[PDB]
Amino acid sequence: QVKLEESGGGLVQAEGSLRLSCVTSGRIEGILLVGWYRQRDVVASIDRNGNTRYDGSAEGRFTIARENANTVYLQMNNLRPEDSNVYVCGALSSGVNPWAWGQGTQVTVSS
User: Fold this and answer.
1) What is the three-state SS of 46-111?
2) Quick check: 19 and 74 in contact, CB under 8 A?
3) Residue of 31, 39, 40, 78 whose CA lies nearest to 57
């Protein structure tokens, strides 16, 4: 009953930037946390109180922010080839089906 749709990935050169966007639809009232995950290990997350959490590799280069009630983005600066990955948006809700996942977004960082 929560659906996630992702955009913003693609191909970029090293030291470039991307902004990944995750849009939620459905029963968003029960969402406790929205995050971006390396396809699943967390990169960054933002919870219902606005608290943000970053993995050590993201801290200082990436920023997660909530744009509105349905939209969370991850600004990725100073990308490196080792950052090439499929990134997936996840939402943690309260209840029996706790996790919802987006379709996944390819990020490729060229040398």
Assistant:
1) EECCCCEEECCCCCCCEEEEEEECCEEEEEECCCCHHHCEEEEEEEEECCCCCEEECCCEEEEEEC
2) yes
3) 78
Query: How many CB atoms are closer than 10 A to CB 15?
Result: 10
Beta pairing, strands 105-110 & 10-13: parallel
Q: Is 84 buried (19+), middle (13-18) or exposed (0-12) by CB count in 10 A?
A: middle
The reported resolution of this PDB entry, expressed in Å, is 1.8
Place of tokens 């706790």: 98
Method: X-ray
Distance CA 55, CA 62 (A): 10
∠ Cα 72 76 80 (to 5°): 150
Residue 97 contacts by C-beta under 8 Å, 6 or more apart in sequence? 1
CA–CA dist 44, 26 (Å, integer): 22
